[PDB]
Amino acid sequence: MQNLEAQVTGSLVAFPDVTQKALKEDEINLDSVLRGKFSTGRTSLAWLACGPQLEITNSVTGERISAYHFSGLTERPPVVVAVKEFTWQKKTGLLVGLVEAEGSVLCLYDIGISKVVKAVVLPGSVTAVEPIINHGGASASTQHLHQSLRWFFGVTAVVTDVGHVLLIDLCLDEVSSNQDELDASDLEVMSVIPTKIPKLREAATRERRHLCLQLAAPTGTTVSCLSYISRTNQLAVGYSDGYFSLWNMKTLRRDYHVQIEGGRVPVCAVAFQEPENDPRNCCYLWAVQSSESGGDVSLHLLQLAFSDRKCLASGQIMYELLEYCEERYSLDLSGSTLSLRGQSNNTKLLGCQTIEKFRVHGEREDGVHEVTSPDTSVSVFSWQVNTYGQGKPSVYLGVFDINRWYQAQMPDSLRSGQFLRNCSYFAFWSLEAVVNITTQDIIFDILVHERSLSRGIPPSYPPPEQFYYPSTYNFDATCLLNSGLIHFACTGFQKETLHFLKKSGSSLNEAIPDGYNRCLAAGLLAPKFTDVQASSLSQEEQLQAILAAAVETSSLGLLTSCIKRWTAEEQPRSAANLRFVLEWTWKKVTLTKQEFDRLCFR
Amino acid sequence: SVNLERSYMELIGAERETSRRNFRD
Amino acid sequence: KGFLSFLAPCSSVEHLYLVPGEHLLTVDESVICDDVDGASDIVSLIQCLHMIADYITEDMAYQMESACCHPQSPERVAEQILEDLIANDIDNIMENIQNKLQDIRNPIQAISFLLQNMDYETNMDMEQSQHNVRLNLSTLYGSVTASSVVCQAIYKISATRFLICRDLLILQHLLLRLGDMALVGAGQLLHSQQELIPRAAQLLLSYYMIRWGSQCLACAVPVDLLESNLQHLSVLELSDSQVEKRRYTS
Amino acid sequence: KDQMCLMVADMLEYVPVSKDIRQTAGTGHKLRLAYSDTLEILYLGVYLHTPRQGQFCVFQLVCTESNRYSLEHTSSIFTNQETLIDFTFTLSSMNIWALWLDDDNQTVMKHINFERNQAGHWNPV
């Protein structure tokens, strides 16, 4: 069912003056570039940094939560390139990887009072970081770690600009390797994978070093993307030349390495998707090949083959014994697949997230229920498309529903331009309204809130087919800029029309045609009301159907408010409408009492 | 158990009766 | 400038209530409460409470008080309040409330958790029989500043518990009337609701009593008449004389 | 008694570096003393008023055997640009309190435990 473009609910809640000064002051100094992204987890923050400065603002408002000036042992601006949540000893904070021309800085940042709680100097150059396990030494019942990693207490997988992957122990189990803000330790990087891990960790600790294992990886290539799929216990590493290598860290070895179409097009993003029911134990991984300066841009649906789908005591289903990773569906976004520009388009991924909504009923006597398999699982890709000539990015927010795609039974036809948001397997929202404000503002990230992404409640379970359309998905989201945050709503058109009609309820009859048409287009009406249009009906029968539906919705208040509205202002057909609705009410009473008698006589 | 966030709230003290100390010039 | 105030930590329930429940979603789950599942249930409850409060006003409270004062039971007044709220439907906010309710697992656990979170008063009879002093802190404190602070605090907590109990009764009645419209397993839930309604009603009655008393003014009465009433009561054996310091405010 | 300046100590050197503040010629900086009777430790709660953003910083006074004295950085608490009326810091529950009067002439004041994690949050009153 068709959608509507992003609905603005308050534009450009800009960042504070101190934040704007702090971010834009370092953009002139050498080795400094402005970066920004939202932080996902128990935090509700958006981080923006230009070298030493780090600004943390509210993720839905933009107000400066905190701000800090901090560098390493060199004055070259350490640009925050990576931010990932980290929970140690029930302390919830952030691990931040800052890149310098002379090295890198790893910082631990515990939400409290606006400083840094740990700082470590890294000899390499950080491009992306990812926490594998929060408590490595306490992880011995779920099989995702290696023997060396289980000797660690917190493992950080970092990808450098040489194509290598380094697994670093944060050494939070050791007090002689825990560093302060101005104190730091080097890394005893072991290229090999040893069997004397406790002894070598002790040696590093005594020599004031963290234990690091650099895996034998291609040298010369640069890792364009790093991710951790804990469901499959795999480390997704993508190189700037389209080579995708997937590592079994239960052996710390490359279980797979392939070339995804593109030789200069890097693997820009990876998104994991689990169908609502898979008996083949195979899930999907969208790998997006996107040019960073213009060229061919392809969305690849990589099917992953795993032999084992184990249940291990970590509250997770763990996929093991990888066989292959092969692209199974390609969509060219450089041309026209969801856009109206056929020539080569420079596509940049503003955001790449996966949202799963779990629906568990309680409603019994005192107790607790647990989450189950998601009835709604989607991969959201927010992207900007530049058509060269003016350099103006048009932003689109595409949503691929793996569950709806499976219910559509593996669609494989390449879509070609125009509006096709009605499709359930894949849809997309035109962000042109937000673009009209962010014509020049550099969108650093786009966060679609999990609490925002939700569906309505039905008057009688099971939910109607409207629940299974993206039009029912009402969700607010925030785009990060270099000037602030812009917040918008999606699929609020239905409630906008409904409330406009209700406020016009004193003259509701004349607006019933257009309002009913808008509700039908948005899918607000029940699936049975979509088959009849307001053009072929009259406002009176449309209103009678709406009143009936409000009765089955157990919503007497809408009828009462509408009739009270009609009591005011000139509207000649109000008397006729109330007459018809009163005989309808009495005959409905008669039919309901008859049906109740039929149920109760048996 | 874990942590403690607390907010204070203003409760007006002073005398319910009307009496204040006059400064000795 | 001139006068004085003390900054006293809000209780757990009051501190949570004074902040909209939606913002509690941004504060760590173990910080909201020790039971993370219970914490989520209580966060959903307080989100619903703030949702109701955004539309319930103080004039509603005044007319509810008058409805209780002249013949009408508070259960009937609460029914009328919820009926007005439902009749004012333009967006069907009851559907939003129900959606937030499915986030709660077995709401009996969460409502009883609010019950235990507010339970600080127990049925004990303390007469003027003096207990054995263990410190001089027994006689310590009791000044007029303490009296003013205590009266302000009891007024404030009476108002807060007033609003909270009213919202609790409204939610109880609404959930009882909803039945199976999006719900499952309501066969056992509703009967427990029937039993929990009178108890919450009596709790609301007590808290209305205390809020009304906090709202009640008192006249300036001579200490001579005060002590004459004391002597008469002691003679009739309803009280035993105990005098430390008696004050009448100006 | 020596009538000479023994050392010049930069408060921002014990904090992760902030370049602008140390060369700023701002005025209105505040010092507060908090002594732990049972610890024999004196804490300098120093509010450095920066036009960018003022900050509370907690130091411990250390006097070495050679009459050289230094500040041990316990924590630093940034503040937003307001007209700070007062501020205090206690060692009994290890807390910062701050009272500002904003440029709109409104009384605001807040508290925070300055050892309750270290990345930015305040508890309002």
Coordinates of N, CA, C and O in Angstrom, one line a residue, chain A residues 413-535:
Chain A
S413 N 12.9 -9.8 -9.1 CA 12.8 -8.9 -10.3 C 13.4 -7.6 -9.9 O 13.1 -7.0 -8.9
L414 N 14.4 -7.1 -10.7 CA 15.0 -5.8 -10.5 C 14.0 -4.7 -10.8 O 13.5 -4.5 -11.9
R415 N 13.6 -3.9 -9.8 CA 12.7 -2.8 -9.9 C 13.4 -1.7 -10.7 O 14.6 -1.6 -10.6
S416 N 12.6 -0.8 -11.3 CA 13.2 0.2 -12.2 C 12.5 1.5 -11.9 O 11.4 1.8 -12.5
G417 N 13.1 2.4 -11.1 CA 12.6 3.7 -10.9 C 11.2 3.9 -10.4 O 10.6 2.9 -10.0
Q418 N 10.7 5.1 -10.5 CA 9.3 5.5 -10.1 C 9.0 5.1 -8.6 O 9.9 4.8 -7.9
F419 N 7.8 5.3 -8.2 CA 7.4 5.0 -6.9 C 6.8 3.6 -6.7 O 5.8 3.2 -7.4
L420 N 7.5 2.8 -5.9 CA 7.0 1.5 -5.6 C 7.0 1.1 -4.1 O 7.3 0.0 -3.7
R421 N 6.8 2.1 -3.3 CA 6.8 2.0 -1.8 C 5.7 1.0 -1.3 O 5.7 0.6 -0.2
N422 N 4.7 0.7 -2.2 CA 3.6 -0.2 -1.8 C 4.1 -1.6 -1.6 O 3.5 -2.4 -0.9
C423 N 5.3 -1.9 -2.2 CA 5.8 -3.3 -2.1 C 6.2 -3.6 -0.7 O 6.9 -2.8 0.0
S424 N 5.8 -4.8 -0.2 CA 6.1 -5.2 1.2 C 7.5 -5.7 1.4 O 8.2 -5.5 2.4
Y425 N 8.0 -6.5 0.4 CA 9.4 -7.0 0.5 C 10.4 -5.9 0.6 O 11.4 -6.0 1.4
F426 N 10.3 -4.9 -0.3 CA 11.2 -3.7 -0.2 C 10.4 -2.5 -0.5 O 9.6 -2.4 -1.4
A427 N 10.6 -1.4 0.3 CA 10.0 -0.1 0.1 C 11.0 0.9 0.3 O 12.2 0.6 0.7
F428 N 10.7 2.2 0.1 CA 11.6 3.3 0.3 C 10.8 4.6 0.5 O 9.8 4.8 -0.2
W429 N 11.3 5.5 1.3 CA 10.7 6.8 1.6 C 11.5 7.8 0.9 O 12.8 7.8 1.0
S430 N 10.9 8.7 0.1 CA 11.5 9.9 -0.4 C 11.7 10.9 0.7 O 10.7 11.4 1.3
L431 N 13.0 11.2 1.0 CA 13.3 12.2 2.0 C 13.5 13.6 1.4 O 14.2 14.4 1.9
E432 N 12.7 13.9 0.3 CA 12.9 15.2 -0.3 C 12.5 16.3 0.6 O 13.2 17.4 0.5
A433 N 11.6 16.2 1.5 CA 11.2 17.2 2.5 C 12.4 17.5 3.4 O 12.7 18.7 3.6
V434 N 13.1 16.5 3.9 CA 14.3 16.7 4.7 C 15.4 17.3 3.9 O 16.2 18.1 4.4
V435 N 15.5 16.9 2.6 CA 16.5 17.4 1.7 C 16.3 18.9 1.5 O 17.3 19.7 1.5
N436 N 15.1 19.4 1.5 CA 14.8 20.8 1.3 C 15.4 21.6 2.4 O 15.6 22.8 2.2
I437 N 15.6 21.1 3.5 CA 16.3 21.8 4.6 C 17.8 21.5 4.5 O 18.7 22.4 4.6
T438 N 18.2 20.2 4.4 CA 19.6 19.8 4.3 C 20.1 19.7 2.9 O 20.6 18.7 2.4
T439 N 19.9 20.8 2.1 CA 20.5 20.9 0.8 C 22.0 20.9 0.8 O 22.6 20.2 0.0
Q440 N 22.6 21.5 1.8 CA 24.0 21.6 1.9 C 24.6 21.0 3.2 O 25.7 20.6 3.3
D441 N 23.7 20.8 4.3 CA 24.1 20.2 5.5 C 24.6 18.8 5.2 O 23.9 18.0 4.6
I442 N 25.8 18.5 5.7 CA 26.4 17.2 5.5 C 25.7 16.2 6.5 O 26.0 16.2 7.7
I443 N 24.8 15.3 6.0 CA 24.2 14.3 6.8 C 25.2 13.3 7.2 O 25.8 12.6 6.3
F444 N 25.5 13.2 8.5 CA 26.5 12.3 9.0 C 26.0 10.9 9.4 O 26.7 9.9 9.2
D445 N 24.7 10.9 9.8 CA 24.0 9.6 10.1 C 22.5 9.9 10.1 O 22.1 11.0 10.2
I446 N 21.8 8.8 10.0 CA 20.3 8.9 10.1 C 19.9 7.7 11.0 O 20.1 6.6 10.7
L447 N 19.3 8.1 12.2 CA 18.8 7.1 13.1 C 17.3 7.0 13.1 O 16.6 8.0 13.3
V448 N 16.8 5.8 12.8 CA 15.4 5.5 12.9 C 15.2 4.8 14.3 O 15.7 3.7 14.5
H449 N 14.4 5.4 15.1 CA 14.3 5.0 16.5 C 13.5 3.7 16.6 O 12.4 3.6 16.0
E450 N 14.0 2.7 17.4 CA 13.2 1.5 17.6 C 11.9 1.8 18.3 O 10.9 1.2 17.9
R451 N 11.9 2.6 19.3 CA 10.7 3.0 20.0 C 9.7 3.7 19.1 O 8.5 3.6 19.2
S452 N 10.3 4.4 18.1 CA 9.4 5.1 17.1 C 8.8 4.1 16.1 O 7.6 4.2 15.8
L453 N 9.6 3.2 15.6 CA 9.1 2.2 14.7 C 8.1 1.2 15.4 O 8.6 0.4 16.1
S454 N 6.8 1.4 15.1 CA 5.8 0.6 15.8 C 4.6 0.6 14.9 O 4.4 1.4 14.0
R455 N 3.7 -0.4 15.2 CA 2.4 -0.5 14.5 C 1.2 -0.3 15.4 O 1.4 -0.3 16.6
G456 N 0.1 0.0 14.8 CA -1.1 0.2 15.6 C -1.7 -1.0 16.2 O -1.2 -2.1 16.1
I457 N -2.8 -0.8 17.0 CA -3.4 -2.0 17.7 C -4.7 -2.3 17.0 O -5.4 -1.3 16.5
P458 N -5.1 -3.5 16.9 CA -6.4 -3.9 16.2 C -7.5 -4.0 17.2 O -7.3 -4.3 18.4
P459 N -8.8 -3.7 16.8 CA -9.9 -3.9 17.7 C -10.2 -5.4 17.9 O -10.9 -5.7 18.9
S460 N -9.6 -6.3 17.1 CA -9.8 -7.7 17.3 C -8.7 -8.5 16.6 O -8.5 -8.4 15.4
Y461 N -7.9 -9.3 17.4 CA -6.9 -10.1 16.9 C -7.5 -11.2 16.1 O -8.5 -11.7 16.4
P462 N -6.8 -11.7 15.0 CA -5.4 -11.2 14.5 C -5.5 -9.9 13.8 O -6.5 -9.5 13.3
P463 N -4.3 -9.3 13.6 CA -4.3 -8.0 12.9 C -4.6 -8.1 11.5 O -4.4 -9.1 10.8
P464 N -5.2 -7.0 10.9 CA -5.6 -7.1 9.5 C -4.4 -7.0 8.6 O -3.3 -6.9 9.0
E465 N -4.7 -7.1 7.3 CA -3.6 -7.0 6.3 C -2.9 -5.7 6.3 O -1.7 -5.6 5.9
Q466 N -3.6 -4.6 6.7 CA -2.9 -3.3 6.9 C -1.7 -3.4 7.7 O -0.7 -2.7 7.5
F467 N -1.7 -4.3 8.8 CA -0.5 -4.5 9.6 C 0.6 -5.0 8.8 O 1.8 -4.7 9.2
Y468 N 0.4 -5.7 7.7 CA 1.4 -6.3 6.9 C 1.9 -5.4 5.8 O 2.7 -5.9 5.0
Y469 N 1.5 -4.2 5.8 CA 1.9 -3.2 4.8 C 2.9 -2.2 5.5 O 2.7 -1.9 6.6
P470 N 3.8 -1.6 4.7 CA 4.7 -0.6 5.3 C 3.9 0.7 5.7 O 4.5 1.5 6.4
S471 N 2.8 0.9 5.1 CA 2.0 2.1 5.4 C 1.6 2.2 6.8 O 1.5 3.3 7.4
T472 N 1.4 1.0 7.5 CA 1.1 1.0 8.9 C 2.3 1.4 9.8 O 2.1 1.9 10.9
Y473 N 3.5 1.2 9.3 CA 4.7 1.6 10.0 C 4.8 3.1 10.2 O 5.1 3.8 9.2
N474 N 4.5 3.6 11.4 CA 4.6 5.0 11.7 C 5.9 5.1 12.5 O 6.0 4.5 13.6
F475 N 6.8 5.9 12.0 CA 8.1 6.0 12.8 C 8.7 7.4 12.6 O 8.7 7.9 11.5
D476 N 9.3 7.9 13.7 CA 10.0 9.1 13.6 C 11.5 8.8 13.6 O 12.0 7.8 14.2
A477 N 12.3 9.7 13.0 CA 13.7 9.5 12.8 C 14.4 10.8 12.8 O 13.8 11.9 12.6
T478 N 15.7 10.8 13.1 CA 16.6 12.0 13.2 C 17.8 11.9 12.3 O 18.5 10.9 12.3
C479 N 18.0 12.9 11.5 CA 19.2 13.0 10.7 C 20.2 14.0 11.3 O 19.8 15.1 11.7
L480 N 21.4 13.5 11.5 CA 22.5 14.3 12.0 C 23.1 15.1 10.9 O 23.2 14.6 9.7
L481 N 23.5 16.3 11.2 CA 24.1 17.2 10.2 C 25.4 17.8 10.8 O 25.9 17.3 11.8
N482 N 26.0 18.8 10.1 CA 27.1 19.5 10.6 C 26.6 20.8 11.3 O 27.4 21.7 11.6
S483 N 25.3 21.0 11.4 CA 24.7 22.2 12.0 C 23.7 21.8 13.1 O 23.3 22.7 13.9
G484 N 23.3 20.6 13.2 CA 22.3 20.2 14.2 C 21.7 18.9 13.8 O 22.3 18.0 13.3
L485 N 20.4 18.7 14.2 CA 19.6 17.5 14.0 C 18.3 18.0 13.3 O 17.7 19.0 13.7
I486 N 17.8 17.1 12.4 CA 16.5 17.4 11.8 C 15.7 16.1 12.0 O 16.1 15.0 11.6
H487 N 14.5 16.3 12.6 CA 13.6 15.2 13.0 C 12.4 15.2 12.1 O 11.8 16.2 11.9
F488 N 12.0 14.0 11.7 CA 10.8 13.9 10.8 C 10.0 12.6 11.2 O 10.5 11.8 12.0
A489 N 8.8 12.6 10.7 CA 7.9 11.5 10.9 C 7.6 10.8 9.6 O 7.7 11.4 8.5
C490 N 7.3 9.5 9.6 CA 7.0 8.7 8.4 C 5.7 8.0 8.6 O 5.5 7.3 9.6
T491 N 4.9 8.1 7.6 CA 3.5 7.6 7.5 C 2.6 8.1 8.6 O 1.7 7.4 9.1
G492 N 2.8 9.4 8.9 CA 1.8 10.1 9.7 C 0.7 10.8 8.9 O -0.2 11.5 9.5
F493 N 0.7 10.5 7.6 CA -0.3 11.2 6.8 C -1.7 10.8 7.1 O -2.7 11.6 7.1
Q494 N -1.9 9.5 7.5 CA -3.2 9.0 7.9 C -3.8 9.7 9.1 O -4.9 10.2 9.1
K495 N -3.0 9.9 10.2 CA -3.5 10.6 11.3 C -3.6 12.1 11.1 O -4.5 12.8 11.7
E496 N -2.8 12.6 10.2 CA -2.9 14.0 9.8 C -4.3 14.3 9.2 O -5.0 15.2 9.5
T497 N -4.7 13.4 8.2 CA -6.0 13.5 7.6 C -7.1 13.3 8.6 O -8.1 14.1 8.6
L498 N -6.9 12.3 9.5 CA -8.0 12.1 10.5 C -8.2 13.2 11.4 O -9.4 13.6 11.6
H499 N -7.1 13.8 11.9 CA -7.3 14.9 12.8 C -7.7 16.2 12.1 O -8.5 17.0 12.7
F500 N -7.3 16.4 10.9 CA -7.9 17.6 10.1 C -9.4 17.4 9.9 O -10.1 18.4 10.1
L501 N -9.8 16.2 9.6 CA -11.3 16.0 9.4 C -12.0 16.2 10.8 O -13.0 16.8 10.8
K502 N -11.4 15.7 11.9 CA -12.1 15.8 13.2 C -12.2 17.3 13.6 O -13.2 17.7 14.1
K503 N -11.1 18.1 13.4 CA -11.2 19.5 13.7 C -12.1 20.2 12.8 O -12.7 21.2 13.2
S504 N -12.3 19.7 11.6 CA -13.3 20.2 10.7 C -14.6 19.5 10.9 O -15.5 19.7 10.1
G505 N -14.8 18.8 12.0 CA -16.0 18.0 12.3 C -17.3 18.8 12.4 O -18.3 18.3 12.2
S506 N -17.2 20.1 12.6 CA -18.3 21.0 12.5 C -18.8 21.2 11.1 O -20.0 21.6 10.9
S507 N -18.0 20.9 10.1 CA -18.4 20.9 8.7 C -17.8 19.7 8.1 O -17.3 19.7 6.9
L508 N -17.8 18.5 8.8 CA -17.1 17.3 8.4 C -17.6 16.8 7.1 O -16.9 16.2 6.3
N509 N -18.9 17.0 6.8 CA -19.6 16.4 5.7 C -19.0 16.8 4.3 O -18.8 15.9 3.5
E510 N -18.6 18.0 4.1 CA -18.1 18.5 2.9 C -16.7 17.9 2.6 O -16.3 17.7 1.5
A511 N -15.9 17.7 3.7 CA -14.6 17.2 3.6 C -14.5 15.7 3.6 O -13.4 15.1 3.4
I512 N -15.7 15.0 3.9 CA -15.7 13.5 3.9 C -15.2 13.0 2.5 O -14.4 12.0 2.6
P513 N -15.5 13.5 1.4 CA -14.9 12.9 0.1 C -13.4 12.9 0.1 O -12.8 11.8 0.1
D514 N -12.8 14.1 0.2 CA -11.4 14.1 0.1 C -10.7 13.5 1.3 O -9.7 12.8 1.2
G515 N -11.3 13.6 2.5 CA -10.7 13.0 3.7 C -10.7 11.5 3.7 O -9.8 10.8 4.0
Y516 N -11.9 11.0 3.2 CA -12.0 9.5 3.1 C -11.1 9.0 2.0 O -10.5 7.9 2.2
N517 N -10.9 9.8 0.9 CA -9.9 9.4 -0.1 C -8.5 9.3 0.5 O -7.8 8.4 0.2
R518 N -8.2 10.3 1.3 CA -6.8 10.3 1.9 C -6.6 9.2 2.9 O -5.6 8.6 2.9
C519 N -7.6 8.9 3.7 CA -7.5 7.8 4.6 C -7.4 6.5 3.9 O -6.6 5.6 4.2
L520 N -8.1 6.3 2.8 CA -8.0 5.1 2.0 C -6.6 5.0 1.3 O -6.0 3.9 1.3
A521 N -6.1 6.1 0.8 CA -4.8 6.1 0.2 C -3.7 5.7 1.3 O -2.8 5.0 1.0
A522 N -3.8 6.3 2.5 CA -2.9 6.0 3.5 C -3.1 4.6 4.1 O -2.2 4.1 4.8
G523 N -4.2 4.0 3.9 CA -4.5 2.6 4.5 C -5.0 2.7 5.9 O -5.1 1.6 6.5
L524 N -5.4 3.9 6.4 CA -6.0 4.0 7.7 C -7.3 3.2 7.8 O -7.5 2.6 8.8
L525 N -8.1 3.3 6.8 CA -9.3 2.5 6.8 C -9.0 1.0 6.8 O -7.9 0.6 6.5
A526 N -10.0 0.3 7.3 CA -9.9 -1.2 7.4 C -9.7 -1.7 6.0 O -10.1 -1.1 5.0
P527 N -9.2 -2.9 5.8 CA -9.0 -3.5 4.5 C -10.2 -3.5 3.7 O -10.2 -3.5 2.4
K528 N -11.4 -3.7 4.3 CA -12.7 -3.8 3.6 C -13.1 -2.4 3.1 O -13.9 -2.4 2.1
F529 N -12.7 -1.3 3.7 CA -13.1 0.0 3.2 C -12.2 0.5 2.0 O -12.6 1.6 1.4
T530 N -11.2 -0.2 1.7 CA -10.3 0.2 0.6 C -11.0 -0.1 -0.8 O -10.7 0.6 -1.8
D531 N -11.9 -1.0 -0.9 CA -12.5 -1.4 -2.1 C -13.6 -0.4 -2.6 O -14.0 -0.5 -3.7
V532 N -13.9 0.6 -1.8 CA -14.9 1.6 -2.1 C -14.3 3.0 -2.0 O -13.8 3.3 -0.9
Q533 N -14.4 3.8 -3.0 CA -13.8 5.1 -3.1 C -14.8 6.2 -2.7 O -16.0 6.0 -2.9
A534 N -14.3 7.3 -2.3 CA -15.2 8.4 -1.9 C -15.8 9.1 -3.1 O -16.9 9.7 -3.0
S535 N -15.2 8.9 -4.3 CA -15.7 9.5 -5.5 C -17.0 8.8 -6.0 O -17.9 9.4 -6.4

